[PDB]
Amino acid sequence: MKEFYLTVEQIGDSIFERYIDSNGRERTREVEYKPSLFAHCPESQATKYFDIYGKPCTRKLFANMRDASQWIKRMEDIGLEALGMDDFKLAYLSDTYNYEIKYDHTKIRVANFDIEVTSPDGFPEPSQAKHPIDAITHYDSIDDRFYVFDLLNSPYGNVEEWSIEIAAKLQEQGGDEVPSEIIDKIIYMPFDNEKELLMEYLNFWQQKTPVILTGWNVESFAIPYVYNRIKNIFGESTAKRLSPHRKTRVKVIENMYGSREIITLFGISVLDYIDLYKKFSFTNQPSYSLDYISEFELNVGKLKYDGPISKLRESNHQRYISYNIIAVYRVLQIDAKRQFINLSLDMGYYAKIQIQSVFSPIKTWDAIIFNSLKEQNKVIPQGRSHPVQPYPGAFVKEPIPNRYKYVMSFDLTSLYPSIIRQVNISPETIAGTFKVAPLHDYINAVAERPSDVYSCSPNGMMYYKDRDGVVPTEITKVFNQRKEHKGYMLAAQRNGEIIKEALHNPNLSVDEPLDVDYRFDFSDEIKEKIKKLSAKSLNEMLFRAQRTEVAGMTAQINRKALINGLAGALGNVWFRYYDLRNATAITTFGQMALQWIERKVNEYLNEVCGTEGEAFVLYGDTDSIYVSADKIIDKVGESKFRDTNHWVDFLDKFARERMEPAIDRGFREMCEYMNNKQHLMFMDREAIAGPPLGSKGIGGFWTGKKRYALNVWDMEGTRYAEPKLKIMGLETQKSSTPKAVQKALKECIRRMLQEGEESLQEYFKEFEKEFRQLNYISIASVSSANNIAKYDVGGFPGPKCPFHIRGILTYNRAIKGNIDAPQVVEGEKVYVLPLREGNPFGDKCIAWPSGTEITDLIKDDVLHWMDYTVLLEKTFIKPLEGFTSAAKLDYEKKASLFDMFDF
DNA sequence: TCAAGTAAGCAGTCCGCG
DNA sequence: GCGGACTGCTTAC
Numbered sequence A: 001m002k003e004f005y006l007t008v009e010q011i012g013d014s015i016f017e018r019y020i021d022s023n024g025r026e027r028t029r030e031v032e033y034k035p036s037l038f039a040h041c042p043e044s045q046a047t048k049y050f051d052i053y054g055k056p057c058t059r060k061l062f063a064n065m066r067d068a069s070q071w072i073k074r075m076e077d078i079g080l081e082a083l084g085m086d087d088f089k090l091a092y093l094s095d096t097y098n099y100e101i102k103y104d105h106t107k108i109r110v111a112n113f114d115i116e117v118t119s120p121d122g123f124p125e126p127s128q129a130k131h132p133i134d135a136i137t138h139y140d141s142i143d144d145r146f147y148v149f150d151l152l153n154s155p156y157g158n159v160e161e162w163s164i165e166i167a168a169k170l171q172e173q174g175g176d177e178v179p180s181e182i183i184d185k186i187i188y189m190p191f192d193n194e195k196e197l198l199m200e201y202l203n204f205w206q207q208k209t210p211v212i213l214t215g216w217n218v219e220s221f222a223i224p225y226v227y228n229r230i231k232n233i234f235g236e237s238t239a240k241r242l243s244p245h246r247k248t249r250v251k252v253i254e255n256m257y258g259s260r261e262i263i264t265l266f267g268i269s270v271l272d273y274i275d276l277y278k279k280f281s282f283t284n285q286p287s288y289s290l291d292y293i294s295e296f297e298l299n300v301g302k303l304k305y306d307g308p309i310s311k312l313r314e315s316n317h318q319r320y321i322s323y324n325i326i327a328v329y330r331v332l333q334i335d336a337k338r339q340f341i342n343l344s345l346d347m348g349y350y351a352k353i354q355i356q357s358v359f360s361p362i363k364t365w366d367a368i369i370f371n372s373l374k375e376q377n378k379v380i381p382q383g384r385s386h387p388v389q390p391y392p393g394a395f396v397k398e399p400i401p402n403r404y405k406y407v408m409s410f411d412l413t414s415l416y417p418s419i420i421r422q423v424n425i426s427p428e429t430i431a432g433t434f435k436v437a438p439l440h441d442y443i444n445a446v447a448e449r450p451s452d453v454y455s456c457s458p459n460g461m462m463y464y465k466d467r468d469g470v471v472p473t474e475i476t477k478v479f480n481q482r483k484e485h486k487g488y489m490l491a492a493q494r495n496g497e498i499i500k501e502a503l504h505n506p507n508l509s510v511d512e513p514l515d516v517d518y519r520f521d522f523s524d525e526i527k528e529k530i531k532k533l534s535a536k537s538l539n540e541m542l543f544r545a546q547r548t549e550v551a552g553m554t555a556q557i558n559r560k561a562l563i564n565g566l567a568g569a570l571g572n573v574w575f576r577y578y579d580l581r582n583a584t585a586i587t588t589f590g591q592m593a594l595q596w597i598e599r600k601v602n603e604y605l606n607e608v609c610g611t612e613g614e615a616f617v618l619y620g621d622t623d624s625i626y627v628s629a630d631k632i633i634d635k636v637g638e639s640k641f642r643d644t645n646h647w648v649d650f651l652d653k654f655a656r657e658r659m660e661p662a663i664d665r666g667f668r669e670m671c672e673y674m675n676n677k678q679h680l681m682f683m684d685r686e687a688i689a690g691p692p693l694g695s696k697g698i699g700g701f702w703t704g705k706k707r708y709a710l711n712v713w714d715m716e717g718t719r720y721a722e723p724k725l726k727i728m729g730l731e732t733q734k735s736s737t738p739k740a741v742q743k744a745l746k747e748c749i750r751r752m753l754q755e756g757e758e759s760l761q762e763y764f765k766e767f768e769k770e771f772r773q774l775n776y777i778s779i780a781s782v783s784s785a786n787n788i789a790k791y792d793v794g795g796f797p798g799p800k801c802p803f804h805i806r807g808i809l810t811y812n813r814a815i816k817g818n819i820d821a822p823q824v825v826e827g828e829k830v831y832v833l834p835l836r837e838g839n840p841f842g843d844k845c846i847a848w849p850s851g852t853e854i855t856d857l858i859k860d861d862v863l864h865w866m867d868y869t870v871l872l873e874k875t876f877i878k879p880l881e882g883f884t885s886a887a888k889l890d891y892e893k894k895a896s897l898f899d900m901f902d903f
Numbered sequence B: 001t002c003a004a005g006t007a008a009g010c011a012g013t014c015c016g017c018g
Numbered sequence C: 001g002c003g004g005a006c007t008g009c010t011t012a013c
């Protein structure tokens, strides 16, 4: 096999690399890597190295990395550019792996671990590590085993060994229900004392040294705690054995309102799953506890136990260990679904960076672009300092708040990356500037043509057309990968809908799910077999189709995130290729394109309808337009359609055969007007929306910018078995909105869009009557809580104190003096409830850590004083009033003359 | 919330608005 | 009581 790196580090003048050799063996080596950097040289001096602008450079080979770093300093002292890759390990990787890396995940040791620490005096601070580690479960991907290290004797209690037989039993048998499929994969090791436990763990670590280290909150808790605990018991040298190169560093992570410490283990790539999840999942959760996320992702019930966690080991050590093992498995289950580790490896090896650098788009793109240029013997420029400056972004049309019955939307393919490609926007393709007219003049095609020679953006920038810039070139490669995976995602999505349809008529029989690749549209043969399958088999296929779709979603959406991140990076001062001229060339072209096509679509449709100045485009945001199709439907006549699907087909055909060609013509003209290098503005139909044929549903409504709801029948070629609500921006979509309220508001919207005003009124009246029965957690608001200290005037709300912060201060007084009560963590999220006047908490609201039950110390009192009236009005009635006034409907039946008596 | 970008919504505080 | 200036938080893209 071809070799590939596992990890790389710079330690002084040595590169330390762990890698898989040509025989598939893990190896380590120390290399005295001599780096090269570059300086501009005279035209005379013959060279093969040129900077991205075509100016000649001399290569400087240094005796060692320290010399190179020092030279960079002196070059700054002199005031001259020091060119080349200043991150020496990236240059090392580029030299050592000068080919497209193909990696084998089966050779990469991926470790997933979790520890337990009993603490009777509150949260056990990793930086202190004053409490024994009493459990470690460590899963190894190469062995496919869970290694369980269990402390039987501690100052906080001596316990009996964990029993695998009881662990396997159902909760109803008194067991812990450790999943049967991992029972045989557990290697259990009890220990007489903590020193023994930790010494054995370190020996185990040495034999099975993680390459990728993951788990839940491992970077902020598990790793620093293990490191600091071993340091406290044995000393520094022993704790550094967690690093294969025996090198560690405390890293201070700074944010706006403080800082925290983590331990960097040289020679290990830490990918904390909570951070992977936050970056790659595209969710915003009310809580990020493993329990909450597992339930959300996997639909597994929370891990139940009696009493506080600080008494769990002593009271039920059996459950204690089982839950430690289950916690490790949950992360594995989430990754089996989401595949973020696979994604991270793909991206890391593609860019040739330390795997953990995938968290940084800037680092990722710096490496991709460096490797690309190096292949042509080109030399990258030095990074410079820039002051942070605001710059303009996308255009969003102000909609007329209203109901909108029939709607067709259209969307540009991967807009920002397409603009970069079309215009040829790159650091080295800048050709000059032209005199800009007001954006309106370009939108209306009355401005003078910018250039007869170069490719232009309406921000005034011109670009070369003779060759592609490196940014367009590299962005295209990733865009093409993204396209492939999106293809698989949509096929799986369409396949899912085929199965749902079949599920309307499941056969009475015993059979098996078909063995198929869900990434490709089902053939006619497969469809026929599906129509004969049992519900059991069909549901299994649906689950599998949906898992395939999730895998495709992960692969496609995060590759899109990467290329969009490059457009954004051009506007970040730490990016080597930072340039507001290029960042704004993109955004400004975007504004023109959206409004240009709005005009063209309006023009086209007015022509087809034979009307004048009518506004068909009702809304647009960045790269999408929403078109009223009422007149198109009315041209045929609603009474002439057989069913809902009939007009959906009709609108689909009209969009594809009439509107898209017109849109294409419009954008080709714009391309020529801007003299762009390549036409890549591809705007296809996205959604077809409307009420069910013959219903009183309103189809859709807008309340304002970034706030709307549509009843969609077809999305990007997926014809739904059942209509799907597309709701953007509304309270149903916000993590701050109480869970039960999201649900209720969503049902109100469904009724508005699908059934009509009377159905809406029926549901509202019922929710209003019954909501007081809802679990307090389901009706609590949620909010991140920052700057708590700023607003704490020992210990009451200071001036301008935010509502949720006030709740926290209320909570803090109510639990003061209590060492064991759960503390609100700065920067985390809290549940928030309003309190009725005269309550014993002495304030109008209380807040506690999200994803948790409020402590029994005050639960009863909170429940008794909860202000249901305020809650309802603020979280439900206000938003609903917004929806209904926009849609021009009433959520409460207004009086009429008919109310004048039945008999 | 360490880690690419801007636009823009709504809750809430403070306080004017005769 | 509503709206502006402002902070805080959260989405859409």
Ligand SMILES: O=c1ccn([C@H]2C[C@H](O)[C@@H](COP(=O)(O)NP(=O)(O)OP(=O)(O)O)O2)c(=O)[nH]1
Binding pocket: A411, A412, A413, A414, A415, A416, A417, A560, A564, A567, A568, A622, A623, B005, C013
């Ligand atoms: O996180 C984002 C999302 C979007 N954008 C910009 C770039 C993107 O091209 C544009 C439109 O975003 P979409 O959600 O429409 N996705 P995009 O058009 O990039 O690809 P596609 O529409 O094909 O999914 O908005 C960002 O800069 N950052």
Ligand SMILES: [Ca+2]
Binding pocket: A115, A116, A324, A327
């Ligand atoms: Ca735990």
Ligand SMILES: [Ca+2]
Binding pocket: A346, A347, A350, A481
């Ligand atoms: Ca790849």
Ligand SMILES: [Ca+2]
Binding pocket: A411, A412, A413, A414, A415, A623
């Ligand atoms: Ca798009």
Ligand SMILES: [Ca+2]
Binding pocket: none
């Ligand atoms: Ca998309």
Ligand SMILES: [Ca+2]
Binding pocket: A502, A505, A506, A507, A530, A531, A532, A533
């Ligand atoms: Ca059937």
Ligand SMILES: [Ca+2]
Binding pocket: A411, A412, A621, A622, A623, A624
């Ligand atoms: Ca869009």
Ligand SMILES: [Ca+2]
Binding pocket: none
């Ligand atoms: Ca207001």
